[PDB]
Design a protein around this nucleic acid. Structure first.
Length: 216
RNA sequence: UUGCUCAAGAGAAGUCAUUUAAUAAGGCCACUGUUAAACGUAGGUGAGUCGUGGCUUUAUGCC
């Protein structure tokens, strides 16, 4: 019920050809090529693109599909002229961004992260204690829950970094976090957890997306 | 047993051979969607994969 200050969500309407469901390095590299200053930013995150799933491991862009960026509201003039109204290419297709809209950061008792990556922690228990430690660093208190598939197993995801000729394997979990209170909820939403924040993973969102991800 | 009792209009046959509805035609010439305005002030979101790889002190974050 508390709208966070100093942090906003820059949302660009996204249109173009269908894209892989694991954009990650693809979208990040495209934006970095379009926006050189995006590479050197620190406290910025790119939202997972919202669109229905299509065949293979691709993702189809709808009219509601939009590129959303979480950024310090004073750092917008560093990337706005490079992104607002410009176009970026994923693979061989051209994608166009229009004038973005600002969305405030709302507090929620239960928050969700579709993907959390911590280096060197692959099992569930070590990952859980690592996220507890990360909460301890930021001084946030809450109960950690892991998103599960239809079989109840904790859900894992993989990030493919196509750096140079070799392709890289970075993997993590998707967690659901509640019992946060609005202040710590906003703190976790801005700060995020884990690494690879610009890599379309590690940021947070309300638990409605948690249930939606649980559905499929 | 009925002005009746019985009783095949039956056999066979190409409507055929040939013919351009053809020669010619501009839907054409003309039109202003003219003239004027303070944004005042308060309307929200749809979804994968499975066990360390180049930096960096395991850390923990970058590609």
């Amino acid at each position: 019920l508390i709208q966070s200050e100093e942090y906003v969500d820059l949302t660009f309407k996204l249109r173009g050809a269908p894209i892989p469901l694991d954009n990650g390095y693809l979208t990040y590299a495209a934006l970095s090529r379009i926006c050189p200053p995006l590479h050197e930013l620190k406290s910025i995150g790119i939202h997972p693109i919202a669109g229905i799933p299509t065949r293979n491991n691709l993702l189809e862009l709808t009219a509601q599909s939009r590129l959303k960026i979480r950024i310090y509201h004073q750092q917008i003039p560093l990337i706005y002229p490079y992104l607002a109204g410009q176009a970026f290419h994923i693979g061989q297709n051209f994608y166009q961004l229009d004038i973005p809209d600002y969305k405030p950061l709302i507090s929620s008792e239960s928050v969700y992260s579709r993907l959390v990556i911590i280096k060197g922690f692959q099992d569930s228990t070590n990952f859980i204690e690592a996220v507890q430690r990360q909460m301890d660093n930021l001084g946030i208190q809450g109960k950690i829950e892991l998103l599960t598939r239809q079989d109840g197993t904790p859900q894992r995801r993989q990030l493919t970094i196509n750096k140079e000729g070799k392709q890289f394997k970075v993997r993590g979990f998707g967690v659901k976090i509640s019992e946060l209170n609005p202040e710590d909820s906003l703190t976790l939403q801005e700060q995020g957890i884990g690494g690879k924040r610009k890599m379309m993973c590690g940021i947070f969102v309300p638990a409605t997306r948690s249930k939606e991800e649980e559905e499929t």
